């Protein structure tokens, strides 16, 4: 309910997330969370093919150069994901998701708390 102000509590709150998202949507970086919630679902797939399928879709939506909801990762993170895509495993987007978490956490999160959205 209030504990939000740990960060991952915000994330494990079906209410928290939906909230945070509205903030970001204005601040223009909701893709970070979308990609994050995405990798979260991705993890639940067992079917090898369905995995390759989504692995490729996530890539084209978030990682792909100039992708629509392209996230902000570095060179080493991207190539690595790119290589992982070569064999869709559930651990595929882990690092990417990792770095993304931080970006939200240490940047847009605080500026999020101290604001109307969280009052």
């Amino acid at each position: 309910v209030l504990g939000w102000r740990s960060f991952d509590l915000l994330l494990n709150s079906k209410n928290g997330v939906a909230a945070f998202h509205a903030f970001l949507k204005t601040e223009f970086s909701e893709e970070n969370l979308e990609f994050w919630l995405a990798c979260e679902e991705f993890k639940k797939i067992r079917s090898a093919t369905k995995l390759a399928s989504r692995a490729h879709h996530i890539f084209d939506e978030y990682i792909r150069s100039e992708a629509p909801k392209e996230v902000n990762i570095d060179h080493e993170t991207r190539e690595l994901t790119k290589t992982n895509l070569q064999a869709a495993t559930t651990s595929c987007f882990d690092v990417a998701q990792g770095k993304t978490r931080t970006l939200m956490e240490k940047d847009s999160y605080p500026r999020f708390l101290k604001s109307p959205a969280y009052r």
Partner: protein, 305 residues
């Protein structure tokens, strides 16, 4: 309406922290963590690059306290105050000749801008009573994502953005009616590569970036002010790092004035319509006066309209 646009790590945000100093304890209490990270991290960077470059430790007995740091970065426990054994492991490490040798080659890898500054204050910030300096808050680094708007009136609207390539597609939004635009450019980047691809020359990306931003239609009747930021870092390196590493062509001599003249001409040439003017400024986001003085001048160019 003002756009604080620029490439990655050019200081578009350090500049906003000077629009502030022109930080309640609640805030200063917040940067305590940040400054912890920036430090442990920067040290971490040089540890790793030690391997990637093949830089022998000045003292084997450092591999110990060394790895003790990477675990911290790993354990994520690097946002919390330096445990006694750490503040020392780092101080002792930051004091090895190898670290220094590999640190001096910091242009060959990605190492925090404020790396030196913080590590030269391991003790200063490792105090149980520690409170963040007016500067400590500035020398911090936190990749900005999306567009962050802040307001304020000086002599009678601010827009911060993300510099990396994947942020630029979002820029197009706040592009409507932009009074003026301050464009940051890390002078220090001339011999470095982007964060996004360890290939592209940072300096070069700025030029291709500015060229795009400069001759955009949306800004025909918009004031374009250029901040050739990080002029301090630029000065302490230009003497030992040829500007030709950026411009094979560069015929001048490697001196602050010379290279700055050239670097200034390159950006100004990326301007199309002769019916327009641009404003250079050797700024330094981490020095309030300089920002203060320059921002003043800027307010003029803008009000002078």
């Amino acid at each position: 309406k003002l756009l604080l646009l620029g490439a990655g790590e050019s200081g578009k945000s350090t500049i906003v922290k000077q629009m502030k100093i022109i930080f309640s304890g609640e805030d200063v209490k917040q940067y305590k963590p940040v400054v912890y990270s920036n430090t442990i991290q920067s040290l971490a960077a040089i540890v790793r690059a030690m391997d990637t470059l093949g830089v022998e430790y000045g003292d084997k007995e450092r591999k110990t306290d060394s790895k003790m740091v990477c675990d911290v970065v790993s354990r994520m426990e690097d946002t919390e105050p330096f445990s006694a054994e750490l503040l020392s492991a780092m101080m002792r490490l930051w004091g090895d000749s190898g670290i220094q040798e590999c640190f001096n080659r910091s242009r060959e890898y990605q190492l925090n801008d404020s790396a030196k500054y913080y590590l030269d204050s391991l003790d200063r910030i490792g105090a149980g009573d520690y409170q963040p300096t007016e500067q400590d808050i500035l020398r911090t680094r936190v990749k900005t994502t999306g567009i962050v708007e802040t307001h304020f009136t000086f002599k009678n609207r601010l827009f911060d953005v993300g510099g990396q390539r994947s942020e630029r597609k979002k820029w197009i939004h706040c592009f409507e009616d932009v009074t003026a635009i301050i464009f940051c450019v890390a002078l220090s980047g001339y011999d470095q590569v982007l964060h996004e691809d360890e290939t592209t020359n940072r300096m070069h990306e700025s030029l291709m970036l500015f060229d795009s931003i400069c001759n955009n239609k949306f800004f025909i009747d918009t004031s374009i002010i250029l901040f050739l930021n990080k002029k301090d870092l630029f000065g302490e390196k230009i003497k030992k790092s040829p500007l030709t590493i950026c411009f094979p062509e560069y015929p001048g001599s490697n001196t602050y004035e010379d290279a700055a003249a050239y670097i200034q001409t390159q950006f100004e040439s990326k301007n199309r319509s002769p019916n327009k003017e641009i404003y250079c400024h050797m700024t330094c986001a981490t020095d309030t006066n300089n920002i203060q003085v320059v921002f003043d001048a800027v307010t003029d160019i803008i009000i002078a309209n």
